[PDB]
Amino acid sequence: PEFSSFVVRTNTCGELRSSHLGQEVTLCGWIQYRRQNTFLVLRDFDGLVQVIIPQDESAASVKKILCEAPVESVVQVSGTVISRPAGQENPKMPTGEIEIKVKTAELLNACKKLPFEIKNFVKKTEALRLQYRYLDLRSFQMQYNLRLRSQMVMKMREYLCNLHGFVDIETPTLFKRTPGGAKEFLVPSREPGKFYSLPQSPQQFKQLLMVGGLDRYFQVARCYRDEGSRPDRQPEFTQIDIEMSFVDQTGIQSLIEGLLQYSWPNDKDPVVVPFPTMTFAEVLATYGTDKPDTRFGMKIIDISDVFRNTEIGFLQDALSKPHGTVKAICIPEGAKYLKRKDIESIRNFAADHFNQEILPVFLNANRNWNSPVANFIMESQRLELIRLMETQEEDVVLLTAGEHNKACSLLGKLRLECADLLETRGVVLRDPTLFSFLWVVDFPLFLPKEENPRELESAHHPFTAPHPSDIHLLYTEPKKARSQHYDLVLNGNEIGGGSIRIHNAELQRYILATLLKEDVKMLSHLLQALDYGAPPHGGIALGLDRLICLVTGSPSIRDVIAFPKSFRGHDLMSNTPDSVPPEELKPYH
Amino acid sequence: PEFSSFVVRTNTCGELRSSHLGQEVTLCGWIQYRRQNTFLVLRDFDGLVQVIIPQDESAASVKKILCEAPVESVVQVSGTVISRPAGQENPKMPTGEIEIKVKTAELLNACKKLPFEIKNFVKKTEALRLQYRYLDLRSFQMQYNLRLRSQMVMKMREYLCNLHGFVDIETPTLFKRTPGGAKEFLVPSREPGKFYSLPQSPQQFKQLLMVGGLDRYFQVARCYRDEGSRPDRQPEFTQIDIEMSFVDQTGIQSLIEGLLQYSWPNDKDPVVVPFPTMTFAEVLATYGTDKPDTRFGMKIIDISDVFRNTEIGFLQDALSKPHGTVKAICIPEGAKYLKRKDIESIRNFAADHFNQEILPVFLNANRNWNSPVANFIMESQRLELIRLMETQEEDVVLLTAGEHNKACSLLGKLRLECADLLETRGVVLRDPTLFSFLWVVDFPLFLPKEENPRELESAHHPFTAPHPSDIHLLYTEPKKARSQHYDLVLNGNEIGGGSIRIHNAELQRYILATLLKEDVKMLSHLLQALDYGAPPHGGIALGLDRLICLVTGSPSIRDVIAFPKSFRGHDLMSNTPDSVPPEELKPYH
């Protein structure tokens, strides 16, 4: 990396070290702060270095402007690199062993009082940080974020296009509306009555581009969302769209693995070898949501087998319904971390979420000092629950009973409860420092609402290859047939998702037929391409702003975006979306 | 490049060579054509290879489907690589020394009669090629084009982000309208009365991002244009937007040079070391347009000095007006290449373009057999015009007289006439196989119309650093002051352009003041960033579709685009822009 080059400058401010002692250099940057007549600190985007204000008869004309420069202004300074006298060194900053002795200077631009503290990476005000964003970008935070994004994305670009031979293909933005997932933004055309609509994602051209050769396609595409429901999320975001020809699920499953591994920032942590997978059934059961945390490690396990006996009233009626069961989660070290008080909050959480009894069994630590109903369970099944739940010296097992799904959802939310609990007043088991990736496969193909069941709906995408599994459960009993759709989850977030799009229009035809007709208006152009010898093809979308936010550890995805828009568009920096004089509506309608 | 990998396949169809003899391989692809029971040819995106239909008792079930596959369908075929028997070899194709012997097969997808010839890279019907585009993409032409684009662009991405340390920064698309250059597309927002507008180019954020640190910015941005007149080339196109901090003109002048050199496709021709530059004055004078061909070399030169004497009536009145002059161009070898007939077309071209007498002087070859008026000029000034025009054995000089600008424009278009003439019925002096680049600097800062001169206008961009040159010609006599704006021209095209945007709002203020006021509504947010200590900064835009078209030698820029739109939007493949039921206008207005 040449860095500062093709410019009048040498050696960006922060790169100077002892190696540069004695070297003549002319560097330019911003004025951070100074102490009276003695000091100056220049700051580039990179680091910052210390410039000593020359005090002399010959250098007085230089000292003039160097001390006349306002708060943070742009100055070019030329001089020689010298080592800081004696123990003046500042190990806290990289340039700290050296200072720069001015020869000449000049004032590139001045500035007025700026309502921001650039030193501390500002302070948290969204309104102000955004209104002044061109200022805020100077902060080392925005700098680190945007530079990370650029870097990592470009390394992905390398992994795909250079390494594995994809092609960077730009699909058009302004296009026709395909109302499968959600409604789209409209864009009036000069020709009256007819107008384009921004795409939700380049999933339309996903099939076509695969039909047209191009064995490997990839794009970073700007996708747009008009959201009636949540004014919070961005009006536009960025996705890495990947599509491959002649590939199974396991293949692209490895593709994203190698992609994230190669692209991983190298600054913070490595990533891991192939990501553990799981089935929609298995995550929904053993976690309680399809997007679990997984670094947590608090597992839902089924102990019902030891409860066949023990006719205690609670578990009795639980084992009754043919769909009923009794499961549990084990919170580690919770035996003594949480006070005996805040477990009553866990019990109270029953009331919050779909009220159901949760039983705090202490089978080892604080034993007999707790567990009023569970004292019998402890004194009866202790060793067995030690084996099953796999507990430790100080541990506590939350024990619930009811329907499979109901109890799974319960313990699922409740382990999160144990997270946000055990982290305060103690150790935190979930740190934004480390990362856990999990594959979620075998999702349902169809789901019933919002019209009265069943007009169904497409699970995720209208065209999704069903896990072959006789394939016919489609016709026999839909919603009972699964798909090849997959989701990548990173630390409880959906980082990306996709499916194996289905070829051979024969299959497509009737799925669209049960779903609805006259949709053939829209999609006959696509199914046509299906009858033109479309190859088997599948791919995945990767939310970029999401992944980059997650990796930078930012509070919101607006910290990983150059000029984001808070709260239903409305960029706070410039007035927009704004009105406009009527004669500007004239060329359209 | 791993190429075919992460998939069930080995060895993409076209890569197989003698090196692969005996290697077991399973490859999948498209069926191009076959001869009866004997032959098959599979085609990947890459090359194509020859599959021999096995005829046997054990292989009959394979021969069944392999001969049952329709015209062009998708088949996977597994077998062993063998050499073609004896002299069956086909040196015309890369896989031609080998064929592939089937072991097993299967039919991935079939197809119906497709109204296209994929072998010959179709035939020219824009309507059909576009309507069926997902088909047309299979053609080796679209393949080469899109793959070239992806490749080269990605290498530019390397040169900037990897090599010289730029940052890839996505500026928002939906935004507020800044009606400097042209009107923009509008996009209705869920909140009634106020709506966004697509950007013409990320030139807005060009200043801000430079204010905010990020010493080097770059982006490939989708720029949307709406031109009511003249609407031929499509609404959206790709640009490479570059902006640097603390850089002169000469710097980025070298930047784009290194960029194009590093990025040059390597397939066709090298590029050249630093591009020859020229001044707007000099190109307009010695070429006749700011975008000359330069590989051509037919120069406009001023011979008026030898015409002070020689009171011949024609040149007489020409030397009369204080702004009048008599200039000429010399077409080489034209003396005998063109017939004595088609020079009457050059003379007739007077009538076509702003009718003015052009005089075909033959001063050497076919002498005295031509030049009715010019025979005197020849017999008088011959040696002198030999020196001046620098002619050769067989040469002919086109001689015109009139206003400086008028005659310059004339000979400017007329050398192109001599190009398209001398190339047919003879040698072609302009070959796409070679590229010529030229820098055009020192453009005017201001130009008078369309309101009555002078309400002026911004030459190119409102904020453009004037070539310092006392700077004050702004106030004294505007339109007489030049700028630092630059244009890159490649083979008579404007490949890219930009300027050094101006810092220090002091200067900006009055330029915007003379131009117009209440524009401060829009741009006070920008000039604010000018008073916040914006560094000196400058950059350039690079038309991507243009450059890629020019390098691939395509007829139109729609051959370098995945899914282009011909003739005022209207993608021919899908119906768009289209109308839409009234209740879909309801959420907006």
Side-chain angles (χ1 to χ4, degrees), chain A residues 253-530:
Chain A
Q253 202 171 315
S254 284
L255 177 63
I256 306 311
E257 287 172 356
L259 178 79
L260 298 175
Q261 184 185 14
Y262 190 73
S263 207
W264 220 232
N266 196 342
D267 176 89
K268 47 159 67 77
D269 223 39
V271 77
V272 296
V273 289
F275 296 160
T277 176
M278 209 150 288
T279 66
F280 181 79
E282 280 187 279
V283 279
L284 213 49
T286 69
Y287 281 124
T289 188
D290 43 20
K291 38 172 181 173
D293 226 309
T294 317
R295 42 181 182 167
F296 203 45
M298 199 163 291
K299 294 180 173 182
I300 290 185
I301 93 174
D302 199 319
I303 57 182
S304 302
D305 223 36
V306 315
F307 281 88
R308 168 160 175 82
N309 314 331
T310 306
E311 58 276 58
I312 174 181
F314 188 63
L315 295 318
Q316 278 297 75
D317 317 277
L319 270 299
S320 181
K321 167 179 292 180
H323 218 184
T325 185
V326 42
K327 302 165 174 293
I329 69 179
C330 166
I331 160 171
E333 296 194 42
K336 311 211 180 186
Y337 256 102
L338 299 84
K339 187 187 173 180
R340 214 55 42 79
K341 194 175 60 176
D342 55 27
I343 62 100
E344 281 296 320
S345 297
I346 299 189
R347 299 172 57 80
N348 280 330
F349 197 76
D352 174 90
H353 159 81
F354 285 92
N355 59 328
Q356 187 173 324
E357 168 71 10
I358 179 61
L359 168 62
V361 179
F362 295 82
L363 73 176
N364 299 289
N366 300 269
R367 200 180 70 175
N368 206 277
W369 190 271
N370 303 304
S371 324
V373 177
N375 218 78
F376 173 80
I377 314 301
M378 179 262 303
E379 200 191 352
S380 167
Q381 302 314 315
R382 207 180 61 88
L383 296 82
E384 245 299 324
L385 287 173
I386 301 289
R387 297 304 167 182
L388 267 174
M389 295 303 310
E390 210 296 299
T391 65
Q392 240 61 57
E393 269 297 325
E394 296 191 359
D395 264 14
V396 63
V397 296
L398 277 313
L399 178 273
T400 191
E403 189 192 9
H404 191 279
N405 316 88
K406 201 68 144 47
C408 280
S409 179
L410 169 61
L411 285 177
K413 221 164 299 304
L414 199 63
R415 53 186 300 258
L416 292 183
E417 196 53 62
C418 284
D420 305 337
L421 246 57
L422 177 88
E423 77 174 25
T424 74
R425 292 194 165 182
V427 295
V428 54
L429 205 42
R430 46 159 70 169
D431 60 321
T433 289
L434 175 55
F435 299 98
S436 184
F437 296 95
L438 164 70
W439 283 120
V440 193
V441 306
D442 282 64
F443 279 72
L445 190 48
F446 292 100
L447 287 181
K449 284 205 191 178
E450 289 87 7
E451 200 147 68
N452 65 319
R454 44 161 203 98
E455 290 301 291
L456 305 186
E457 200 183 21
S458 45
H460 317 86
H461 198 58
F463 319 127
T464 304
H467 182 274
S469 89
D470 175 77
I471 319 179
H472 165 48
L473 319 183
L474 282 199
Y475 296 134
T476 306
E477 298 181 4
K479 298 168 285 194
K480 244 65 180 183
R482 50 197 193 282
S483 78
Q484 282 183 263
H485 178 94
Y486 30 78
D487 277 329
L488 190 62
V489 285
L490 165 64
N491 294 22
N493 291 71
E494 174 133 327
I495 176 192
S499 55
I500 300 282
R501 325 283 162 194
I502 187 56
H503 48 99
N504 90 97
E506 175 205 28
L507 200 152
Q508 192 59 250
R509 279 161 63 204
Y510 193 59
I511 295 189
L512 288 181
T514 74
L515 266 52
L516 59 112
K517 295 184 184 181
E518 302 164 347
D519 192 19
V520 206
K521 289 190 184 189
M522 202 77 56
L523 294 176
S524 198
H525 84 264
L526 194 45
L527 75 92
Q528 207 75 21
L530 262 315

Side-chain angles (χ1 to χ4, degrees), chain A residues 22-40:
Chain A
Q23 302 275 45
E24 178 62 35
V25 65
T26 166
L27 61 87
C28 63
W30 285 256
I31 286 195
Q32 186 177 238
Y33 99 104
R34 53 147 151 267
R35 306 179 191 175
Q36 291 165 358
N37 291 71
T38 52
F39 258 20
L40 187 52

Side-chain angles (χ1 to χ4, degrees), chain B residues 382-448:
Chain B
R382 207 180 61 88
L383 296 82
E384 245 299 325
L385 287 172
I386 301 289
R387 297 304 167 182
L388 259 280
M389 295 302 311
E390 210 296 299
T391 65
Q392 240 61 56
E393 269 297 325
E394 296 192 358
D395 264 14
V396 296
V397 296
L398 277 314
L399 178 273
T400 191
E403 189 192 10
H404 191 280
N405 316 88
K406 201 69 143 47
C408 280
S409 179
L410 169 61
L411 285 177
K413 220 163 300 303
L414 199 63
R415 54 186 300 258
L416 292 183
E417 195 52 62
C418 284
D420 304 337
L421 246 58
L422 178 87
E423 77 174 25
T424 73
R425 292 194 165 182
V427 295
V428 54
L429 205 41
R430 49 159 62 182
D431 59 321
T433 324
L434 174 60
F435 302 82
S436 159
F437 287 100
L438 165 71
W439 283 119
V440 192
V441 304
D442 281 64
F443 279 72
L445 190 48
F446 292 100
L447 287 181

Side-chain angles (χ1 to χ4, degrees), chain B residues 46-65:
Chain B
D46 192 328
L48 43 80
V49 84
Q50 171 180 119
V51 207
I52 47 181
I53 305 283
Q55 291 154 327
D56 201 321
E57 298 299 324
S58 52
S61 59
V62 167
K63 176 182 182 184
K64 187 71 177 196
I65 190 53

Side-chain angles (χ1 to χ4, degrees), chain B residues 533-549:
Chain B
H537 63 281
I540 183 187
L542 220 55
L544 192 61
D545 305 13
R546 179 57 58 190
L547 164 61
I548 187 69
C549 179

Side-chain angles (χ1 to χ4, degrees), chain B residues 464-525:
Chain B
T464 304
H467 182 274
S469 90
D470 175 77
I471 319 179
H472 165 48
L473 319 183
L474 282 199
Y475 296 134
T476 306
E477 298 181 4
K479 297 168 285 194
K480 243 65 180 182
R482 50 197 193 282
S483 79
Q484 283 183 264
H485 177 95
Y486 31 78
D487 277 329
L488 190 62
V489 285
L490 165 65
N491 293 23
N493 290 72
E494 174 133 328
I495 175 192
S499 56
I500 300 282
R501 325 282 163 194
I502 187 55
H503 48 99
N504 90 97
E506 175 205 28
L507 200 152
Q508 191 60 250
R509 279 161 62 204
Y510 192 59
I511 294 189
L512 288 180
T514 74
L515 266 52
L516 59 112
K517 295 184 184 181
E518 302 164 346
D519 192 19
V520 206
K521 289 190 184 189
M522 202 77 56
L523 293 177
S524 198
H525 84 264

